């Protein structure tokens with residue numbers, strides 16, 4: 128039949144063909160010889176620092192494709208404005224080597240980038256994104272102001288709103304605008320004498336970096352790290368987020384009264400700050416974006432991963448489970464309660480959150496929408512299926528095709 | 544290039560060089576990844592009415608023979624040289640060849656070892672191989688299958704086994720076991736499209752009935768086998784009840800669980816896959832091991848398109864099924880898997896939970912890294928259907944590719 132990947136849902140027995148992948152312009156890490164789909168960072172997308180200006184020919188092509196996408200989205204392909212805009216970009220790249228996006232083009236691209244994110248399960252919200260333009264930002268201090276406004280607007284006292292702030296694009300031979308921290312909010316990770324870690328092991332390097340740069344460290348398990356902001360060609364400056372702006376939620380269990388005595392907690396705003404936003408060839412090295420948490424991110428990965436807070440054993444001991452034998456499923460039990468505690472605490476504190484069931488169901492709806500609107504949807508199965516109760520959610524039974532579409536959010540090397 | 548493989552829990556890194564030995568193409572291409580897909584668009588195993596290209600076959604044959612003699616440290620030896628000459632002599636004159644029992648045994652084990660979707664390959668070296676190539680009828684197939692079942696079951700102390708029927712032959716029909724497993728519970732369609740029993744077995748249940756089987760009306764009615772000898776209509780055979788060991792399900796603390804009347808069989812044995820060794824194809828080669836609890840507790844009993852018992856268990860547990868956020872599904876799932884483990888251990892029947900199982904697979908990855916320079920694994924199938932990140936394999940990157948000997952899917956005979 129159709130000359131495109133046949134995709135099946137084994138629960139409902141339904142079939143679809145992905146024709147959108149034909150639009151992919153960039154190769155992933157797989158080949159007919161072997162599948163590398165489970166690799167977190169295959170060295171492909173990896174936007175490695177490419178200092179010297181990019182091949183005008185290369186950029187022009189990416190730029191024309193994007194502009195075509197833009198005019199198509201407003202239903203004006205082939206129009207005079209479309210052709211003139213095309214001429215304008217080529218002219219500009221011709222005389223300066225690069226070009227700039229109009230306001231509405233940036234907004235469209237930011238949303239398309241989210242829309243094209245293979246690893247995001249919250250894409251049903253893609254059309255609703257507050258885009259803060261900060262391409263005028265000229266200092267590390269101004270980056271801090273912008274970021275604070277982002278946090279304030281997105282947190283909105285617990286009624287979270289998706290948002291993104293776009294700082295100046297990478298320029299010919301000039302320094303990049305960078306946010307060193309992987310997220311706007313991160314708990315410190317203190318390397319101990321015995322070799323262990325206090326706080327979040329995931330943040331040991333950035334914590335040591337903040338210290339090397341003048342931050343006086345605390346000794347808690349949930350210390351909010353300061354931000355290391357870097358304006359072009361300048362060393363990074365240290366900024367401490369005003370406590371009132373970082374909304375947190377103490378964690379308690381709905382029936383296990385002792386859980387609250389554990390003193391656990393998590394922050395409300397999930398905001399990635401280390402990714403690169405690419406649109407029509409243009410590269411925005413600093414463009415933090417945020418939505419709202421899916422309970423398993425906090426309850427399963429952050430709190431239960433071996434290399435994170437690793438609280439599984441502590442919680443099992445409290446539930447008086449048999450932690451000496453795997454077959455007691457003590458790990459599974461503690462994990463469920465820990466996750467329930469996150470959903471409970473967030474609801475109580477009236478902070479936005481979505482469980483893995485609700486989330487995946489909404490993603491199934493998103494897949495339907497996209498099948499009709501674009502003939503497919505790039506999705507990374509391993510990342511879409513939740514870390515717990517995998518086959519209990521609908522996405523587990525849904526085959527998925529993964530591929531790279533631009534605009535996109537890509538990983539980028541650490542500035543240090 | 545050789546892929547860098549990382550374990551995000553430990554920080555350890557390795558390089559898979561084994562993938563370089565892959566000679567068969569997968570579904571992926573640089574433009575898009577199709578690793579989450581269950582079946583090949585065609586990778587399958589097309590008909591065999593004509594002889595396979597002498598060149599190709601001979602190529603796969605030499606490779607396999609080389610593999611074998613290497614395994615017994617007798618490479619380049621006299622036997623190795625003469626064995627190669629035999630194979631060539633036979634292919635050249637008949638367009639095919641046959642394997643020696645020892646080679647077949649080596650092939651079966653290698654196929655299991657190369658199976659990317661198998662999480663219990665640490666056991667790959669311990670496999671009882673029943674040579675059934677001297678089988679000429681459905682009736683004989685049935686006797687072989689009964690012995691395999693008696694042996695494998697071993698009164699609850701399961702032993703991994705495989706039975707190999709005649710290889711496919713040019714222009715002649717294949718020997719085939721129509722059922723997907725040697726033990727399957729009937730799935731009866733009735734009234735309003737609903738199904739009594741196992742929905743996954745509706746079609747096969749219907750084929751059996753059409754071939755004279757007197758259907759039952761239960762949720763767990765053990766189906767009969769439809770064994771097919773070359774170019775002949777399949778034959779119906781009922782398995783002796785005392786042979787099909789089953790485990791009644793109860794819960795360690797929840798008294799009411801047993802009242803649900805749930806049960807599952809002890810022997811997981813695939814009988815619809817094809818075994819390929821050195822170019823030769825074995826369309827009927829049933830193999831069995833022992834169950835990992837999540838297969839029964841999570842997929843078979845909880846899949847929405849299977850027994851789908853989640854809600855029932857939830858209501859019995861008096862959970863809040865009004866909303867997703869109460870995690871009633873996750874809670875019932877855990878109790879159901881516990882019950883499965885409890886019940887099998889009570890019945891003294893082999894079973895492995897998903898934690899122990901994935902821990903052993905990790906040791907296997909290590910054993911293989913040192914033994915072959917890598918290990919083909921399918922991450923989507925290796926990670927358990929519940930508590931994914933709570934097991935070590937979730938945090939382990941994997942490379943997937945096709946090595947031979949190999950187990951492959953093949954078209955349904957009807």
Ligand code: HEM
Pocket residue numbers: 237241244246247248249250252256289290291399416417418419420421424481486536
């Ligand atoms: C509205 C709520 C949203 C939810 C519930 C949601 C949920 C998720 C989840 C569960 C992940 C995986 C997190 C992990 O495993 O570490 C993710 C990844 C991702 N999301 Fe969304 N998302 C939302 C909003 C957004 C927004 C606004 C953007 C972009 C403008 C976005 C872009 C991405 C990207 C690019 C990734 C992958 C990043 C990486 O590879 O580390 N998401 N999202």
Ligand code: HEM
Pocket residue numbers: 651655658660661662663664666670703704705813830831832833834835838895900924950
């Ligand atoms: C000793 C105990 C064994 C255990 C615990 C084990 C476990 C598993 C599990 C959990 C799966 C996935 C099942 C599913 O989700 O449907 C699997 C798949 C598979 N196993 Fe093993 N296995 C064992 C023995 C064997 C043996 C003896 C063979 C063959 C000689 C084998 C061949 C395979 C193959 C080919 C697959 C993929 C089947 C398919 O794609 O349908 N396994 N195994």
Ligand SMILES: N=C(N)SCCc1ccc(CCSC(=N)N)cc1
Pocket residue numbers: 309310397398399400401402416417418419420421424
């Ligand atoms: N994840 C959500 N529920 S809202 C979307 C914004 C967001 C995406 C991904 C992460 C995980 C860290 S991945 C990284 N920092 N590159 C955190 C925050």
Ligand SMILES: N=C(N)SCCc1ccc(CCSC(=N)N)cc1
Pocket residue numbers: 723724811812813814815816830831832833834835838
């Ligand atoms: N599964 C084990 N624990 S032992 C290995 C033998 C085995 C593998 C897979 C299945 C499931 C059906 S897959 C299919 N029929 N192709 C059944 C039996």
Ligand SMILES: C[C@H](O)[C@H](O)[C@H]1CNc2nc(N)[nH]c(=O)c2N1
Pocket residue numbers: 165166167509510511551937938939940941
């Ligand atoms: C090795 C493996 O790719 C890795 O552990 C992946 C699996 N799936 C994931 N899925 C999500 N959402 N987030 C992750 O960080 C991961 N990690």
Ligand SMILES: C[C@H](O)[C@H](O)[C@H]1CNc2nc(N)[nH]c(=O)c2N1
Pocket residue numbers: 137523524525526527579580581923924925
């Ligand atoms: C669509 C998706 O590939 C499918 O549901 C897969 C996922 N992982 C699996 N893993 C195992 N072990 N067994 C399966 O049947 C599946 N099904």
Ligand SMILES: [Zn+2]
Pocket residue numbers: 157158161162163164571575576577578
């Ligand atoms: Zn792939």
